[PDB]
Amino acid sequence: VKPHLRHYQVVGRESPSEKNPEPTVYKFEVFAPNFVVAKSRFWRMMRVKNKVKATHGDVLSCKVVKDAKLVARNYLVDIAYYSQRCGYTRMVKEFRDVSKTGAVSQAYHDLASRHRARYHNIEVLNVKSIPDHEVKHLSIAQYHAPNLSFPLLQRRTKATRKDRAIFVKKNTKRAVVA
Amino acid sequence: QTKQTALVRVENVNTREDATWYVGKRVCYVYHGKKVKRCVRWSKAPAR
Amino acid sequence: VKSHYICAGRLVRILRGPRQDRVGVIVDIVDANRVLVENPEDAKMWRHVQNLKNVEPLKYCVSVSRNCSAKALKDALASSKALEKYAKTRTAARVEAKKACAVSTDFERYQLRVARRSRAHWARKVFDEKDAKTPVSWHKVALKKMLKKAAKMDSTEGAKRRMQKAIAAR
Amino acid sequence: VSRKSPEYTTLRKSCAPGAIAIILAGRFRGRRAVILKQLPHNGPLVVSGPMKYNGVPIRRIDSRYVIATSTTVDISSVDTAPITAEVFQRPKAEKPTLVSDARAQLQKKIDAALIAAIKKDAQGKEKAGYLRSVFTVKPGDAPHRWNW
RNA sequence: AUCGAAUCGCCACCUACAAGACUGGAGCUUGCUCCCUCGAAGGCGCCAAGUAUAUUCAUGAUCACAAGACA
RNA sequence: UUAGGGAUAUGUGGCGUCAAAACUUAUGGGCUCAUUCUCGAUACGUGAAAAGGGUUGGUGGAUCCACCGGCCCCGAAAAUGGAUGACGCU
RNA sequence: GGCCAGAACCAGCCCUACUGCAUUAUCCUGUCGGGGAUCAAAAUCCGGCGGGCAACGAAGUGCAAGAAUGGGUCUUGGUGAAAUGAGCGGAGUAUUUGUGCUGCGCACGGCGGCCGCACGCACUGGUUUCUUCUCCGUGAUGCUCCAUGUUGGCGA
Ligand SMILES: [K+]
Ligand SMILES: [Mg+2]
Ligand SMILES: [Mg+2]
Ligand SMILES: [Mg+2]
Ligand SMILES: [Mg+2]
Ligand SMILES: [Mg+2]
Ligand SMILES: [Mg+2]
Ligand SMILES: [Mg+2]
Ligand SMILES: [Mg+2]
Ligand SMILES: [Mg+2]
Fold it and tell me: Which residues of the sequence carry a binding annotation for Mg(2+) (chain D) (predicted)?
């Protein structure tokens, strides 16, 4: 399935005034479901880092960064999350995917599963594609062996939806009820 | 329950697209009573 | 072990989805769940991602490396002649037959019904002759057991006289 | 063109004259016949069959009670001109096997022409057997998925 | 014997068994190769006792429970 | 948030049976095994503390050690036979 | 027949199919270097330099106005007892919407007046290569209500 997060770049600034005729221009990378959420995260970061509020600012650009061609790659994601018991916790993890958005979505699902952390308590610090010889975890490194092969066992194959049945003859493909 | 609409399950119809093919078709429920009463072609075809 | 492994260059067949019943070649392995599949022969099989639950491995494996180029893949497929070999199997013929049956008209279904009935009629003709020579059905097996006991005592003098009188009476 | 004109029609394109149809209701349900024409003023269709093959005579039928298949027979040289609503008109009866000579003659002529056309057409034997065949709904059948 | 009824596939080829981390057969190199019946079809049944230029069908008059049922 | 009735579409809540809806949806990702009040599926609210230990993650330090997270377990004793609503579910 | 059914058409309403404009660069593709691995390779990865449209139904992206004209309404009324219609009638068969190309002046961007203009405003600027139908018509001398089809079944 296609990843549920998209890669946004937001460019913004503070509205000019007499005090600051020529304000600075800031660029921001985010992974959000849509551009409204992307703008919300951008303004939150601006408020908590540069003391600039959305009611006194301008958004000059909000665009989507297109993904590269699909190739099996190793992605390093530097991420952090908050919890009441332990404050802020930062970690660095490695995933295998075909795109940066896919890797980040996988990281979000993994954090939700293994630490019960939700979207709005998570900040993504960095994501990059790294070479095979720089991979440190064996669970990731095992997948770039030159002679990797394995069988498919314990499969559950369901029939095509139009052909599914309820009662079927014992050693026969004949359907009895539907 | 709401008694003026009925739900019918048809053999070999297991998807919503299959059920769309049958929209507008005629449907009949057949039973029997206790006595012989009037019917269509009561006099034209006494065998009915 | 007679089970076909998932590896680079392995031919697979898609199970469900819009690409159902098409074949492709595995060019890379992402993780335990996903692979990359391409096939230069088919027009709807550009390089894309397939979940491993939607794949049935075949018995043919071309010799390519991981993340091979398009030119390398096309040359290997022709040299291996795997598509030609696959097209002659019984399962491949079954798949094409299902496509033909799904698009048939009412007249074509009539033609098939005639052909099946003609075969069944000639099967009964062939079976009947061999059955008379060597008894294998339920009724001919009964006849073989019954004739031997019935004949020895039907030759009685009283039986012959009664049979002659009964036949003459009719 | 005018809705009041006798030539007005809204019949669907599948029910063209010369097509083979499956009867869905009435006395001859399940049989296959040949569509001859449509009566004026957007009236019913007329089918023959013909009678020698399946026993259907020249009859009127509403288009909603047939399935028109994609198999067709060229009936250009049949001259279905005498078939009119007058032949189907019935005399009123007041205060209360059998076939009229005109109806029998019309049936004979039309049937002869139709048999000749079918025999002249290619795959004639297959078409004749197809017309003799009977349609039924078997257990396990899914007519909503078929192409006709 | 009242009784008119609803039901609309049948077989004396399915109607025996076991396993899904191993199903036709071998080979070592243990996931590849070779051989075969090529490893996703119980059999019939749907209008000539069988695929052929044979044969009665109406007026039961445009739908109406199927006016018919020991396949 | 409410005159007497149809059609269409939603809200809260749901789609294994009871019971309408995934005839047990996907060609989505992870985690979990619970032996007599019998794990869990309890918004309001209608059970659980200090303190401790099977699997799966993360920070530091060596050449294997401390630290702290998820799910599970112990800590956890009452009076008629009984309650995630029932069956059941891995 | 003021009863029961089927089909056809008309007005309204409801739900379908058929879709163009902007954008893409942290991207696409060659070549050189190092880097990795192998049995030797390639590949994942990092610099430079030269070209660019990832255009198959490109893209999970920002808008969308596509009915000149597919089915349902035992969920509404009717069969022309006023049909106002791009739909009925009459007459023409040419107008003028957009696309493409392009003129002058202004506007816009860059440099410090010249250079650029993706095609903005005015001249309803030019061209007709593609694309499209256009123009007229019926008051109530009807204050209000009711009254009009087709095919079978039942009713002699
Ligand atoms: K190189
Ligand atoms: Mg008539
Ligand atoms: Mg009956
Ligand atoms: Mg239900
Ligand atoms: Mg632990
Ligand atoms: Mg319980
Ligand atoms: Mg409990
Ligand atoms: Mg409950
Ligand atoms: Mg380069
Ligand atoms: Mg007009």
Answer: 60
